[PDB]
Amino acid sequence: PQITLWKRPLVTIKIGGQLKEALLDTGADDTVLEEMNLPGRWKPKMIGGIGGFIKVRQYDQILIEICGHKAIGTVLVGPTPVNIIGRNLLTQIGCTLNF
Amino acid sequence: PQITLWKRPLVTIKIGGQLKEALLDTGADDTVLEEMNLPGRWKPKMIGGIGGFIKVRQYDQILIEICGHKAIGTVLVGPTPVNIIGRNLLTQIGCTLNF
Ligand SMILES: COC(=O)N[C@H](C(=O)N[C@@H](Cc1ccccc1)C[C@H](O)[C@H](Cc1ccccc1)NC(=O)O[C@H]1CO[C@H]2OCC[C@H]21)C1CCCC1
């Protein structure tokens, strides 16, 4: 589909057997989700944003379905105020900017 | 044009008569540019992202040309790590997400 930018581009995602709302973010290199207790091994990581860095847990080869489009990649988990879908997964669903 | 997201969606912008690189950012409500001199009055403002808040200078009704498309709106100037074009101007140039 096509998503205008009058409002935040929020969509429903399915991850780890749960449905959530997440922000399609062309300005994010990575995907960062609110605190959730995903299973499996993880690695510590620091991600920097506009106001500084936060600590996150890096999960690899995680499946996320975005508007029925499936994508598998690295998912970071930490105290982010908003679930963010970054380019690492947006590319996998064929997402583009158009103007 | 149509822009894929395998690399950062960086484009050339023209503001105050000067050329710059900026990130087309659907995950940003506002547009924030690195420290620079801009004509016109400004008022202090705070914006928050991942990591916390930063203090910025808010310039209203600023002309800015984004990839050959003219926009006139609010431009924030402050210690952002990258020049970011947010939704307030992406809507003006008719930018949409598509997948
Ligand atoms: C109302 O609140 C906003 O509108 N605040 C906006 C905002 O910071 N939006 C955030 C989401 C969000 C929204 C609300 C609260 C918390 C977080 C996403 C945005 O695209 C940033 C842009 C960026 C790019 C490079 C460096 C720094 C920042 N990307 C990001 O931080 O990505 C990170 C994960 O992956 C990494 O790659 C790139 C950086 C890493 C600001 C307002 C105008 C400018 C941005």
B interface toward A at CB cutoff 8 Å? 1-6, 8-9, 23-29, 32, 47-54, 67, 69, 80-81, 84, 87, 90-91, 93-99
Instruction: Say whether B25 is catalytic.
Output: yes
Task: Please state, in angstroms and rounded to a whole number, the distance separating the CA atoms of residues B5 and A78.
Answer: 24
Query: What distance lies between CA A85 and its chain's CA centroid?
Result: 3
Using alpha carbons, select from A60, A99, A79, A83 the residue that is nearest to residue A14.
Answer: A83
Breaks (C-N over 2.5 A) in chain B follow: none
Task: Please state, in angstroms and rounded to a whole number, the distance separating the CA atoms of residues A82 and A23.
Answer: 7
The structural domains of chain A, with segments of one domain joined by +, span: 1-99
* Residues of chain A contacting B5 with CB distance shorter than 8 Å: 26, 87, 90-91, 95-97
**Strand pairing report for B69-77 and A84-85:** unpaired
Q: Is A5 near ligand 1, meaning CB less than 6 Å away?
A: no
Using alpha carbons, select from B55, B6, B79, B39 the residue that is nearest to residue A29.
Answer: B6
Task: Please state, in angstroms and rounded to a whole number, the distance separating the CA atoms of residues B33 and A31.
Answer: 23
Spell out the long-range contacts of B41-48 with Cβ–Cβ below 8 A and sequence spacing 24 or more: B42/B77, B45/B76, B47/A50, B47/B76, B47/B78, B48/A50, B48/A51
CB A50 within 8 A of CB B54: yes
Two tokens, residue A73: 């990649």
Using alpha carbons, select from B34, B28, B65 the residue that is nearest to residue B48.
Answer: B28
Residue tagged 């600590």 (tokens): A55
Stretch (H or E) spanning A8: none
**Strand pairing report for B84-85 and B69-77:** unpaired
Q: Does domain A1-99 have CATH number 2.40.70.10?
A: yes
Say how many CA atoms lie within 13 Å of B35 toward its Cβ.
Answer: 3
Residue tagged 């096509």 (tokens): A2
- Gap from CA of B96 to ligand 1 centroid (Å): 18
Task: Please state, in angstroms and rounded to a whole number, the distance separating the CA atoms of residues A11 and B74.
Answer: 26
Q: Is B30 near ligand 1, meaning CB less than 6 Å away?
A: yes
Resolution at which this structure was determined, Å? 2.0
